[PDB]
């Protein structure tokens, strides 16, 4: 053929950051 030649943290905090429902089925960026 041709021959080519040349990230955000958080914290564990009630009001601010809290895991939502299912947190263990869905778990990642969209858990919290």
């Given at each position: 053929?041709?021959?080519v030649t040349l990230v955000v943290?958080?914290?564990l905090e009630?009001?601010?950051v809290?895991?939502?429902k299912?947190?263990?089925m869905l778990e990642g960026?969209?858990?919290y």
């Open positions: 053929k041709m021959v943290t958080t914290i009630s009001p601010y809290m895991m939502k299912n947190h263990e960026n969209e858990r």
